[PDB]
Coordinates of C-alpha atoms and ligand atoms in Angstrom, one line a residue:
Chain C
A3 CA 0.0 0.0 0.0
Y4 CA 2.7 2.6 0.9
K5 CA 6.5 2.9 0.8
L6 CA 8.7 4.8 3.4
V7 CA 12.5 5.4 3.4
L8 CA 14.8 6.6 6.3
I9 CA 18.5 7.5 6.5
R10 CA 20.8 8.0 9.5
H11 CA 23.7 10.5 9.0
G12 CA 27.4 9.4 9.3
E13 CA 30.6 10.4 11.0
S14 CA 30.9 14.1 12.3
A15 CA 33.9 16.3 13.2
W16 CA 33.2 15.7 16.9
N17 CA 33.0 11.9 16.5
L18 CA 36.7 12.2 15.5
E19 CA 37.3 14.0 18.8
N20 CA 35.4 11.3 20.7
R21 CA 33.1 14.0 22.1
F22 CA 29.4 14.1 23.0
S23 CA 27.5 16.2 20.4
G24 CA 23.8 16.2 21.2
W25 CA 22.3 19.5 20.2
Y26 CA 25.7 21.0 19.3
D27 CA 25.7 21.7 15.5
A28 CA 28.7 19.7 14.4
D29 CA 29.4 19.2 10.6
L30 CA 30.2 15.9 8.7
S31 CA 33.7 14.6 8.4
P32 CA 34.9 13.5 4.9
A33 CA 34.0 9.9 5.7
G34 CA 30.4 10.8 6.8
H35 CA 30.0 12.9 3.6
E36 CA 31.2 9.8 1.6
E37 CA 28.6 7.6 3.4
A38 CA 25.8 10.0 2.3
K39 CA 27.1 9.8 -1.3
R40 CA 27.1 6.0 -1.3
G41 CA 23.5 5.8 0.0
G42 CA 22.4 8.4 -2.6
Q43 CA 23.9 6.3 -5.4
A44 CA 22.2 3.1 -4.1
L45 CA 18.9 4.9 -4.3
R46 CA 19.8 6.2 -7.8
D47 CA 20.7 2.7 -9.1
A48 CA 17.4 1.3 -7.9
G49 CA 15.2 4.0 -9.4
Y50 CA 13.7 5.4 -6.2
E51 CA 11.4 8.5 -6.3
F52 CA 10.1 10.8 -3.5
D53 CA 7.5 13.5 -3.2
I54 CA 8.4 15.3 0.1
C55 CA 11.3 15.3 2.5
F56 CA 11.7 15.8 6.3
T57 CA 14.9 16.6 8.4
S58 CA 16.1 18.3 11.6
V59 CA 17.6 21.8 12.1
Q60 CA 21.2 20.3 12.5
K61 CA 23.6 20.6 9.5
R62 CA 24.9 17.0 9.7
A63 CA 21.5 15.7 8.8
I64 CA 20.6 18.6 6.4
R65 CA 23.9 18.1 4.4
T66 CA 23.2 14.3 4.2
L67 CA 19.7 15.1 2.7
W68 CA 21.3 17.6 0.2
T69 CA 23.8 14.9 -0.9
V70 CA 21.1 12.3 -1.5
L71 CA 18.9 14.7 -3.5
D72 CA 21.9 15.7 -5.7
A73 CA 22.7 12.0 -6.3
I74 CA 19.1 11.1 -7.3
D75 CA 18.5 14.3 -9.4
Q76 CA 15.6 15.5 -7.2
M77 CA 16.9 18.8 -5.8
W78 CA 13.5 20.4 -6.8
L79 CA 11.5 18.5 -4.1
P80 CA 9.9 20.4 -1.1
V81 CA 11.9 20.1 2.1
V82 CA 10.6 20.6 5.7
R83 CA 12.9 21.1 8.8
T84 CA 12.0 20.6 12.5
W85 CA 13.6 20.7 15.9
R86 CA 11.5 17.7 16.8
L87 CA 13.8 15.4 14.7
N88 CA 17.0 16.6 16.4
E89 CA 19.4 14.2 18.1
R90 CA 18.9 13.4 21.8
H91 CA 20.0 16.4 24.1
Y92 CA 23.0 15.2 26.2
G93 CA 22.7 18.0 28.9
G94 CA 25.8 18.8 30.8
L95 CA 27.7 16.0 29.0
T96 CA 27.7 18.1 25.8
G97 CA 31.3 18.8 24.7
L98 CA 33.1 16.4 27.0
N99 CA 35.1 13.5 25.6
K100 CA 34.2 10.1 26.5
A101 CA 37.2 9.0 28.6
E102 CA 36.7 12.1 30.7
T103 CA 33.1 11.6 31.8
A104 CA 34.0 8.6 34.0
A105 CA 36.4 10.7 35.9
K106 CA 34.1 13.7 36.1
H107 CA 30.8 11.9 37.0
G108 CA 31.7 8.5 38.3
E109 CA 31.6 4.9 37.0
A110 CA 28.3 4.1 38.7
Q111 CA 26.5 7.0 37.0
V112 CA 28.0 6.1 33.6
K113 CA 26.7 2.5 34.0
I114 CA 23.2 3.8 35.0
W115 CA 23.0 6.3 32.1
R116 CA 24.1 3.6 29.6
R117 CA 21.6 1.1 30.9
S118 CA 18.4 3.0 31.4
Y119 CA 15.4 4.0 29.2
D120 CA 14.2 6.8 31.5
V121 CA 17.1 8.3 33.5
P122 CA 18.4 11.7 32.1
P123 CA 21.9 13.0 32.2
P124 CA 22.7 16.2 34.2
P125 CA 21.2 19.5 33.0
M126 CA 23.0 22.1 30.9
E127 CA 23.3 25.1 33.3
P128 CA 24.0 28.7 32.3
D129 CA 27.7 28.4 33.3
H130 CA 28.2 25.4 30.9
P131 CA 30.6 26.4 28.0
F132 CA 28.0 25.5 25.3
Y133 CA 24.9 26.9 27.1
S134 CA 24.8 30.2 25.1
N135 CA 25.7 28.5 21.8
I136 CA 22.7 26.2 22.0
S137 CA 20.0 27.4 24.5
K138 CA 20.2 31.0 23.2
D139 CA 20.4 30.2 19.5
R140 CA 17.7 32.1 17.6
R141 CA 16.6 29.0 15.7
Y142 CA 14.8 27.9 19.0
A143 CA 13.2 31.3 19.8
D144 CA 9.7 30.2 19.0
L145 CA 9.7 27.3 21.6
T146 CA 7.9 27.6 24.9
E147 CA 9.9 27.4 28.1
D148 CA 8.4 23.9 28.6
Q149 CA 9.5 22.7 25.2
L150 CA 13.2 23.8 25.3
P151 CA 15.1 20.9 27.0
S152 CA 18.1 21.2 29.3
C153 CA 18.7 17.4 29.1
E154 CA 16.8 14.2 27.8
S155 CA 16.4 10.6 28.5
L156 CA 15.6 8.3 25.5
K157 CA 11.9 8.3 26.6
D158 CA 12.0 12.1 26.5
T159 CA 13.5 12.2 22.9
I160 CA 10.9 9.7 21.6
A161 CA 8.0 11.6 23.4
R162 CA 8.9 14.9 21.6
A163 CA 9.5 13.2 18.2
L164 CA 6.3 11.2 17.9
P165 CA 3.8 14.2 17.8
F166 CA 5.5 15.4 14.6
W167 CA 5.2 12.0 13.1
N168 CA 1.5 11.8 14.0
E169 CA 0.5 15.3 13.0
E170 CA 2.6 16.2 10.0
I171 CA 4.1 13.0 8.4
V172 CA 1.2 10.5 8.6
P173 CA -1.3 12.6 6.7
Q174 CA 1.2 13.0 3.8
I175 CA 1.6 9.2 3.7
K176 CA -2.2 8.6 3.6
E177 CA -2.4 11.2 0.8
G178 CA -0.1 8.9 -1.3
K179 CA 3.1 10.9 -1.0
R180 CA 6.4 9.0 -1.1
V181 CA 8.3 10.3 2.0
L182 CA 12.0 10.4 2.7
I183 CA 13.3 11.2 6.3
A184 CA 16.9 12.2 7.0
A185 CA 17.6 12.4 10.7
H186 CA 19.6 11.1 13.7
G187 CA 19.9 7.8 15.6
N188 CA 17.7 8.4 18.6
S189 CA 14.9 10.4 16.8
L190 CA 14.7 7.6 14.2
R191 CA 14.6 5.0 17.0
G192 CA 11.3 6.7 18.1
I193 CA 9.7 6.1 14.7
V194 CA 11.0 2.5 14.5
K195 CA 9.6 1.7 18.0
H196 CA 6.2 3.1 17.1
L197 CA 6.0 1.3 13.7
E198 CA 7.2 -2.2 14.8
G199 CA 5.8 -2.2 18.3
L200 CA 9.2 -2.9 19.9
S201 CA 9.9 -3.1 23.7
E202 CA 12.1 -0.6 25.5
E203 CA 14.8 -3.3 26.0
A204 CA 14.8 -4.2 22.2
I205 CA 14.8 -0.6 21.0
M206 CA 17.8 0.2 23.3
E207 CA 19.6 -2.7 21.7
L208 CA 18.8 -1.6 18.1
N209 CA 21.5 0.5 16.5
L210 CA 20.8 1.6 12.9
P211 CA 23.6 1.5 10.3
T212 CA 24.8 4.9 9.0
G213 CA 24.4 6.0 5.4
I214 CA 22.4 2.9 4.4
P215 CA 18.8 3.5 3.3
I216 CA 16.2 1.8 5.5
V217 CA 13.0 0.7 3.6
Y218 CA 9.5 0.0 5.0
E219 CA 6.5 -1.5 3.0
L220 CA 3.3 -0.5 4.8
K222 CA -3.4 0.5 4.5
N223 CA -3.3 0.8 8.3
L224 CA 0.4 1.9 8.3
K225 CA 1.5 -1.5 9.7
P226 CA 4.8 -2.9 8.4
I227 CA 4.3 -5.9 6.0
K228 CA 7.8 -7.1 7.0
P229 CA 10.5 -5.5 9.2
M230 CA 13.0 -3.0 8.0
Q231 CA 15.1 -3.9 4.9
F232 CA 18.4 -2.4 3.8
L233 CA 19.3 -1.1 0.3
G234 CA 22.8 -1.7 -1.1
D235 CA 25.3 -4.3 -2.1
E236 CA 24.7 -7.5 -0.2
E237 CA 28.3 -7.8 1.1
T238 CA 28.8 -4.2 2.2
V239 CA 25.4 -4.4 4.1
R240 CA 26.4 -7.7 5.9
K241 CA 29.7 -6.2 7.1
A242 CA 28.2 -2.9 8.4
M243 CA 25.6 -4.8 10.5
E244 CA 28.2 -7.1 11.9
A245 CA 30.3 -4.0 12.8
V246 CA 27.3 -2.3 14.5
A247 CA 26.4 -5.5 16.5
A248 CA 30.0 -5.9 17.7
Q249 CA 30.1 -2.2 18.8
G250 CA 26.9 -2.7 20.7
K251 CA 28.1 -5.9 22.4
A252 CA 31.4 -4.4 23.4
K253 CA 29.7 -1.6 25.4
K254 CA 28.2 -4.2 27.9
Chain Q
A2 CA 13.1 51.2 10.0
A3 CA 13.0 50.6 6.2
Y4 CA 12.4 47.0 5.3
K5 CA 15.5 45.3 3.9
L6 CA 15.2 42.8 0.9
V7 CA 18.1 40.9 -0.7
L8 CA 18.2 39.3 -4.3
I9 CA 20.8 37.2 -6.0
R10 CA 21.0 36.0 -9.7
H11 CA 22.8 32.6 -10.3
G12 CA 26.1 32.5 -12.1
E13 CA 27.5 30.8 -15.2
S14 CA 26.0 27.4 -16.2
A15 CA 27.3 24.4 -18.1
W16 CA 25.3 25.4 -21.2
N17 CA 26.6 29.0 -21.1
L18 CA 30.0 27.6 -21.8
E19 CA 28.5 26.1 -25.1
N20 CA 26.5 29.3 -26.0
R21 CA 23.3 27.2 -26.0
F22 CA 19.8 28.4 -24.9
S23 CA 18.8 26.8 -21.6
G24 CA 15.4 28.2 -20.6
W25 CA 13.4 25.6 -18.7
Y26 CA 16.1 22.9 -19.4
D27 CA 17.6 22.0 -16.0
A28 CA 21.3 22.7 -16.6
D29 CA 23.7 22.7 -13.5
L30 CA 26.2 25.5 -12.6
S31 CA 29.8 25.4 -14.0
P32 CA 32.7 25.4 -11.6
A33 CA 33.1 29.1 -12.1
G34 CA 29.4 29.7 -11.3
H35 CA 29.7 27.8 -8.1
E36 CA 32.8 29.9 -7.2
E37 CA 30.7 33.0 -7.9
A38 CA 28.1 31.9 -5.4
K39 CA 30.8 31.2 -2.7
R40 CA 32.1 34.8 -3.1
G41 CA 28.5 36.2 -2.8
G42 CA 27.9 34.2 0.4
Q43 CA 31.2 35.4 1.9
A44 CA 30.1 39.0 1.2
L45 CA 26.9 38.4 3.1
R46 CA 28.8 36.8 6.0
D47 CA 31.3 39.7 6.2
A48 CA 28.4 42.2 6.4
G49 CA 26.7 40.1 9.1
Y50 CA 23.3 39.6 7.4
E51 CA 20.6 37.4 8.9
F52 CA 17.5 36.0 7.2
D53 CA 14.2 34.4 8.3
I54 CA 12.9 32.7 5.0
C55 CA 14.2 32.0 1.5
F56 CA 12.4 31.7 -1.9
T57 CA 13.8 30.0 -5.1
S58 CA 12.7 28.3 -8.4
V59 CA 12.5 24.5 -9.2
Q60 CA 15.7 24.7 -11.3
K61 CA 19.0 23.3 -9.8
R62 CA 21.3 26.2 -10.9
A63 CA 19.3 28.6 -8.7
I64 CA 18.8 26.0 -5.9
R65 CA 22.5 25.2 -5.8
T66 CA 23.3 29.0 -5.6
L67 CA 21.0 29.3 -2.5
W68 CA 22.5 26.2 -0.9
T69 CA 26.0 27.6 -1.3
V70 CA 25.0 31.0 0.3
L71 CA 23.3 29.4 3.3
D72 CA 26.4 27.3 3.9
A73 CA 28.6 30.3 3.8
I74 CA 26.5 32.3 6.3
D75 CA 25.8 29.3 8.7
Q76 CA 22.0 29.5 8.1
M77 CA 21.3 26.0 6.7
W78 CA 18.3 25.6 9.1
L79 CA 16.1 28.3 7.5
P80 CA 12.8 27.4 5.8
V81 CA 13.0 27.2 2.0
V82 CA 10.1 27.5 -0.5
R83 CA 10.4 26.5 -4.2
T84 CA 8.1 27.6 -7.0
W85 CA 7.9 27.2 -10.8
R86 CA 6.7 30.9 -11.0
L87 CA 10.3 32.0 -10.3
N88 CA 11.8 29.9 -13.2
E89 CA 13.9 31.4 -16.1
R90 CA 12.1 32.4 -19.3
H91 CA 11.0 29.5 -21.5
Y92 CA 12.8 29.8 -24.9
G93 CA 10.5 27.4 -26.8
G94 CA 11.9 25.8 -30.0
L95 CA 15.3 27.6 -29.4
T96 CA 16.0 25.4 -26.4
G97 CA 19.2 23.5 -27.0
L98 CA 20.4 25.4 -30.0
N99 CA 23.5 27.5 -30.0
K100 CA 23.6 31.0 -31.6
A101 CA 25.1 29.8 -34.9
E102 CA 22.4 27.1 -35.4
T103 CA 19.7 29.6 -34.4
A104 CA 20.8 32.1 -37.0
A105 CA 21.2 29.4 -39.7
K106 CA 17.7 27.9 -39.0
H107 CA 15.6 31.1 -38.4
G108 CA 17.5 33.9 -40.2
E109 CA 19.0 37.2 -39.1
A110 CA 15.8 39.3 -39.3
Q111 CA 13.7 37.1 -36.9
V112 CA 16.8 37.0 -34.5
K113 CA 16.8 40.8 -34.4
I114 CA 13.0 40.8 -33.8
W115 CA 13.1 38.3 -31.0
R116 CA 16.0 40.0 -29.2
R117 CA 14.6 43.5 -29.5
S118 CA 11.0 42.8 -28.6
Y119 CA 9.1 43.0 -25.2
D120 CA 6.0 41.0 -26.3
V121 CA 6.9 38.8 -29.3
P122 CA 7.6 35.1 -28.3
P123 CA 10.0 32.7 -30.0
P124 CA 8.7 29.6 -31.9
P125 CA 6.9 27.0 -29.8
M126 CA 8.4 23.7 -28.6
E127 CA 6.5 21.0 -30.5
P128 CA 6.2 17.2 -30.0
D129 CA 9.1 16.5 -32.4
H130 CA 11.5 18.8 -30.6
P131 CA 14.5 16.9 -29.0
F132 CA 13.8 18.3 -25.5
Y133 CA 9.9 18.2 -25.6
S134 CA 9.6 15.1 -23.4
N135 CA 12.5 16.1 -21.2
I136 CA 10.7 19.3 -20.1
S137 CA 7.0 19.0 -20.8
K138 CA 6.7 15.5 -19.3
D139 CA 8.8 16.2 -16.2
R140 CA 6.7 15.3 -13.2
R141 CA 7.6 18.5 -11.3
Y142 CA 5.0 20.3 -13.4
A143 CA 2.2 17.7 -13.0
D144 CA 0.0 20.0 -10.9
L145 CA -0.1 22.9 -13.4
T146 CA -3.2 23.2 -15.5
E147 CA -2.8 22.7 -19.2
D148 CA -3.4 26.4 -19.4
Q149 CA -0.2 27.1 -17.4
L150 CA 2.5 25.0 -18.9
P151 CA 4.2 27.1 -21.6
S152 CA 5.4 26.0 -25.0
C153 CA 7.3 29.4 -25.2
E154 CA 7.3 32.8 -23.5
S155 CA 7.9 36.4 -24.3
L156 CA 9.5 38.6 -21.6
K157 CA 6.0 40.0 -20.9
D158 CA 4.8 36.4 -20.4
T159 CA 7.5 35.6 -17.9
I160 CA 6.8 38.8 -15.9
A161 CA 3.0 38.1 -15.9
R162 CA 3.4 34.6 -14.4
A163 CA 6.0 35.7 -11.8
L164 CA 4.3 38.6 -10.2
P165 CA 1.3 36.7 -8.7
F166 CA 3.7 34.9 -6.4
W167 CA 5.3 38.2 -5.3
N168 CA 1.9 39.8 -4.6
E169 CA 0.2 36.8 -2.9
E170 CA 3.0 35.2 -0.9
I171 CA 6.2 37.3 -0.6
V172 CA 4.5 40.7 0.2
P173 CA 2.6 39.3 3.2
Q174 CA 5.9 37.9 4.6
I175 CA 7.6 41.2 4.2
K176 CA 4.7 43.0 6.0
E177 CA 5.0 40.5 8.9
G178 CA 8.6 41.7 9.4
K179 CA 10.4 38.6 8.1
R180 CA 13.8 39.2 6.5
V181 CA 13.6 37.7 2.9
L182 CA 16.2 36.3 0.6
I183 CA 15.3 35.5 -3.1
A184 CA 17.6 33.3 -5.2
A185 CA 16.5 33.1 -8.9
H186 CA 17.1 33.9 -12.6
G187 CA 17.7 37.0 -14.7
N188 CA 14.3 37.4 -16.3
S189 CA 12.1 36.5 -13.3
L190 CA 14.1 38.9 -11.1
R191 CA 13.6 41.5 -13.9
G192 CA 9.8 41.2 -13.2
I193 CA 10.3 42.1 -9.5
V194 CA 12.6 45.1 -10.3
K195 CA 10.2 46.4 -12.9
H196 CA 7.3 46.3 -10.4
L197 CA 9.3 47.8 -7.5
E198 CA 10.6 50.8 -9.5
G199 CA 7.7 51.4 -12.0
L200 CA 10.0 50.9 -15.0
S201 CA 8.9 51.2 -18.6
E202 CA 9.2 48.3 -21.1
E203 CA 12.3 49.9 -22.9
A204 CA 14.0 50.6 -19.5
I205 CA 13.6 47.0 -18.3
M206 CA 14.8 45.6 -21.6
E207 CA 18.0 47.7 -21.1
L208 CA 18.6 46.5 -17.5
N209 CA 21.1 43.6 -17.1
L210 CA 21.5 42.3 -13.6
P211 CA 25.0 41.2 -12.4
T212 CA 25.5 37.6 -11.4
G213 CA 26.5 36.1 -8.1
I214 CA 26.4 39.5 -6.2
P215 CA 24.0 40.4 -3.4
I216 CA 21.5 43.1 -4.5
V217 CA 20.0 45.1 -1.6
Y218 CA 16.8 47.1 -1.5
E219 CA 15.5 49.4 1.3
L220 CA 11.6 49.8 1.2
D221 CA 9.2 52.2 2.9
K222 CA 5.9 51.3 4.6
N223 CA 4.2 51.2 1.1
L224 CA 7.0 48.8 -0.1
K225 CA 8.4 51.4 -2.5
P226 CA 12.2 51.8 -2.7
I227 CA 13.7 54.9 -1.0
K228 CA 16.8 54.9 -3.2
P229 CA 18.4 52.9 -6.0
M230 CA 19.5 49.2 -5.6
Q231 CA 23.0 48.7 -4.0
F232 CA 25.5 45.9 -4.0
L233 CA 27.7 44.0 -1.5
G234 CA 31.3 43.0 -1.8
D235 CA 34.8 44.3 -2.4
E236 CA 35.4 47.7 -4.1
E237 CA 36.3 46.3 -7.5
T238 CA 33.3 43.8 -7.7
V239 CA 30.9 46.4 -6.4
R240 CA 32.1 49.1 -8.8
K241 CA 32.0 46.7 -11.8
Ligands
LIG1 CL1 16.6 22.9 1.0

């Protein structure tokens, strides 16, 4: 009945520094730009067509979208940007590197934060070095004091992404529009959890590959089969083995 | 507090380098035209400009110009609206011909007429034309009525289909206090300039807008300019 496509952006400049990004507006590295080019070419070779596109207000996802639309010769499509598809907000951890947080905040808190669906990191306070860069950026000036986060658990991120799905994306799908969504890991986890009916435990163990297009075949918007991946069979198998091993090593 | 409006015309295209008529054919920028857009964006960055909403056409040479500018000024998050009403003039049967082939096929007298005329269109693009399916069966125009898809346009025609978008969508945004950027093409921008200044037909046919340079207007509460258009950039570029 309907076809939906998602794509997760690749490596950023702050991933090379092993630093928590969150709402900080870091750009793609050369490797992450290459990953977007490869996913665009896979869509081009298979003949995919879209009618409308959604992304966040962060340049690493917007530049991924731009690269895909260049590759498939569809730069003329309408594009809609929203803060509700941003990455999870990492609070006071924003800007710290990852071997430092265990010394700053303790091994017990690091374990809890990695394990839990509903425990937030510490808040970003006004003396934090990236407070003015993010909380006072004019792109968020139209948010209420309640909507602007100082920190987020996974449950929080999913709870602020799903109203945009429900209210803006679903009516385009029912109208027959072929939709493309270019966003981030945790905001796309929200959509996947809602579509497939996954548990909290399973969705915390699901890490999506980067730069690989994710395809859903859906009248009642229920998946006919689970997510499928577009690309060369061998390159896909290796990326999923890599992501699984990275997940297992963190426990 | 005069309203501030900024326009930019795209630079050199791949088909300019072959001296071929483009029109509604969707040719990309050349490397030099991309470099032009980078210099225009750097001029806006150095002057500290900020925008709230952007408008452009459905053609990739204008869209890529806008993308380059937003990258240079760190405003990639702004909302963007595309419309066919801002497209370049449709050159009809001349699409794809270079100037030599045009003179050989249609003669010198008709060439003088078409170049010198405000309201005489070129020949229509018919179903045997090489580019007829490429343009007139492109799905991006599927929601136009059969009344609206051109087989050819005079300059008068182009201006007549561009101004309804200015009047019905851009003017209310300016009256709400939004800071507007428009990235488009020579002839569609000519329509906006002719309306803003009250220019005659002959005057607008003599006006040639520079490429890749920010063009700035200051407007009063009735949206009339208070002084002539000005330009942003180094001394040499601005003076030229
Ligand atoms: Cl865009």
